[PDB]
């Protein structure tokens, strides 16, 4: 492929554009015809030195793109997502994409260096607001200055992929899709390009299986906590009397614990997303996979922004408890969460620390509900949408910037947060809790990286989870709570 981070980003490409075949009635259609509009491209080529080119086949059924990758073999970058169903919530901006998967890539996007407002413009460079469904698929480190282990280096401090072929569900329909992108100055040609793609369309699979099976067919062999058990309370301790006391101006800190499960054969990370998919309520999944890389997969409910061309939207978090399985335990929970002086204070410096992200780059922002309480299947919690109108659709870059992190998963004041977190936690959160999503032309979203782990061959998973550390807060409780947050992965693997 080429790194598109080394292109001259000042510099359009000679075409951004998507060509659509003729709709067939079934996937083996889709790639069949696909094949023949890549040879078709070939024989008659546009002629820029640089350049993006999608051709897509509109398929007449609606496919599960998860399905699509499962019978997909391993051609890196995998990448996966799904964008949340949104149930009840109102939509705060006033032909939908279900979900994409992808196989290789056209061009990627990755530096040891964090993602600057270049880099944006590097992606930008590939992307059009008429070519909708062109779009760069990858996420963010949590924080991109810390040390990188190894199990993270693949990923760099970011990653985004245009998948070489990929698959859209739709409502109704469905979706084949192959990228050619090239720029001679990278020295990745227009015949570089359809070679190698030419060579992926040959071994795609249209043997797309609807999989049901709940089995993974692997074993546990151990599991571990980091930090364990009997350090994660110090811990916790040690952030608890840093907020109370007057030397320090913390007033909540989230902290992590990766939970490391070794398994006697390997795990099938898209099987396993697909079965928390088929149970997730209200929540993205994603697949962030670059070659030779551990697969970073998560059912994460939680938002980092939405863009629709001038609108974008994001949300606040705070104040966590569990959920009961009695009706009268689960809504005196929530009637707590609700009426605690202490829990409105404490939801309000981060709603109110989001809003005023937005508010310095938006003209407006709407803040609704002001408070509730977002019932999840484990946990619940206190809640808010916040909305805002960009002036112009370039300040995308400024909001990204604005947000990640925010307090849901880093603290504040945000520098002692990030500090305590760097001396308190002995592992890389890499991607985890960091931005994953897509960038677009007219449309792009990020959800936060929570909810989420790392599979690797030869090895088993990492599976992570953080809680909020304010005045007040339990160690038990918050170890418990950190036991709910992963259980859809350690259930499922049995
Ligand atoms: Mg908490």
């Known amino acids: 492929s080429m790194n598109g981070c080394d292109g001259d980003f000042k510099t359009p490409l000679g075409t951004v554009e998507t060509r659509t075949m003729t709709a067939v009635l079934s996937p083996a259609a889709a790639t069949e015809r696909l094949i023949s ?136 329909s469905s979706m084949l899709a192959a990228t050619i992108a090239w720029d001679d100055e990278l020295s990745w040609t227009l015949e570089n390009a359809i070679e190698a793609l030419q060579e992926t369309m040959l071994q795609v699979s249209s043997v797309v299986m609807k999989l049901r099976n709940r089995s993974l067919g692997v074993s546990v062999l151990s599991k571990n906590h980091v930090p364990t058990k009997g350090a994660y309370f110090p811990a916790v301790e040690k952030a608890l009397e840093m907020i109370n006391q007057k030397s320090s101006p913390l007033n ?38 670059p070659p030779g890389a551990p697969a970073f997969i998560g059912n994460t409910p939680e938002r980092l922004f939405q863009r629709t061309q001038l609108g974008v939207c994001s949300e606040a978090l705070a104040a966590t408890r569990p959920r009961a399985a009695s009706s009268a335990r689960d809504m005196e929970i929530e009637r707590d969460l609700l009426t605690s002086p202490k829990d409105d204070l404490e939801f309000s410096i981060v709603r109110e620390n989001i809003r005023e992200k937005l508010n ?45 992190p925010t307090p849901a998963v880093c603290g504040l004041p945000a520098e002692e947060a990030r500090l305590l977190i760097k001396e308190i936690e002995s592992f890389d959160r890499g991607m985890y809790a960091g931005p994953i999503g897509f960038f677009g032309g007219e449309e792009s979203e990020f959800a936060v990286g929570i909810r989420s782990a790392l599979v690797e061959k030869g090895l088993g998973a990492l599976i992570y989870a953080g809680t909020g550390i304010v005045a007040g807060s339990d160690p038990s409780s918050e170890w418990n709570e950190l036991d709910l947050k992963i259980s859809q992965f350690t259930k499922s693997i049995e």
Request: with cysteine; proline share 5%; glycine share 6%.
């Open 360 to 404: 310095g780059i938006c003209d407006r922002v709407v803040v609704k509900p002001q408070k509730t309480v977002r019932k999840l299947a484990r946990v619940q919690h206190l809640y808010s949408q916040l909305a805002g109108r960009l002036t112009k659709e370039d300040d995308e870059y400024k909001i990204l910037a604005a947000l990640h």
């Open 37 to 172: 509009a890549v040879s078709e491209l070939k024989s008659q080529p546009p002629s820029f030195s640089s350049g993006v080119v999608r051709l897509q086949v509109p398929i007449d059924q609606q496919i599960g793109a998860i399905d699509w990758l499962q019978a997909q073999n391993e051609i890196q970058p995998r990448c996966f997502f799904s964008r949340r169903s949104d149930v009840g919530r109102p939509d705060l901006l006033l032909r939908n994409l279900v979900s994409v998967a992808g196989i290789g890539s056209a061009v990627f996007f990755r530096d040891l260096d964090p993602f600057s407002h270049d880099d944006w413009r590097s992606i930008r460079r590939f992307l059009s607001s008429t070519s909708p469904l062109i779009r760069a698929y990858g996420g963010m480190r949590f924080d991109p200055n810390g040390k990188i282990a190894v199990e993270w280096e693949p990923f760099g401090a970011f990653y985004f992929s245009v998948p070489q072929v990929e698959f859209n569900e739709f409502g109704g």
């Open 252 to 289: 909540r800190v989230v902290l992590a614990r990766n939970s490391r499960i070794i398994t006697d054969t390997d795990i099938d990370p898209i099987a396993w997303l697909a079965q928390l998919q088929r149970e997730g309520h209200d929540a993205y999944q994603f697949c962030l996979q």
